Design a protein. Structure first.
Length: 164
């Protein structure tokens, strides 16, 4: 299992513009287009993103191209972030994937706000950090996904994703 397979279990693949758990316009593998309520604003961002007139629909290939950019940007954001970098460097390969998954879903900013859990993960207090991560809007709003990510940080293995 790797970061791309993991995220693709979590986000799914949709070739037509759709709404987020959040109500936001998205396409592909969890590629947020706009937080704006117009399908028209979304369509426009879509065409800007792909470089063609898409009419709200893309190919598998265009979806994976967006996914490759988003993953790359997530990692680079982690590496550039003063709060994130140190935690990332301290972690093993599997747990590194769990932090990347959080950043992909919630952005650099959002994750950097989990101060206390970040501190515990750095310290390698896995069980404590798992309890702390669960006390969040994130977990309450998307519990099955949060629980998979959390188990991943807890154990350091890919079992939460075996099932799936």
């Amino acid at each position: 299992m790797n970061i791309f397979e993991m995220l693709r279990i979590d986000e799914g693949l949709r070739l037509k513009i759709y709404k987020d758990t959040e109500g936001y316009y998205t396409i592909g593998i969890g590629h947020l287009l706009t937080k704006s309520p117009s399908l028209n604003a979304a369509k426009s961002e879509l065409d800007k993103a792909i470089g063609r007139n898409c009419n709200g629909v893309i190919t598998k290939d265009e979806a994976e191209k967006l996914f490759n950019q988003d993953v790359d940007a997530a990692v680079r954001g982690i590496l550039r972030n003063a709060k994130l970098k140190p935690v990332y460097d301290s972690l093993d390969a599997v747990r590194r994937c769990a932090l990347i998954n959080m950043v992909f879903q919630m952005g650099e900013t959002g994750v950097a706000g989990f101060t206390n859990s970040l501190r515990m993960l750095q310290q390698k207090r896995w069980d404590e950090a798992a309890v702390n991560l669960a006390k969040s809007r994130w977990y309450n709003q998307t519990p099955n996904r949060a629980k998979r990510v959390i188990t991943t940080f807890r154990t350091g293995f890919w079992d939460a994703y075996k099932n799936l």
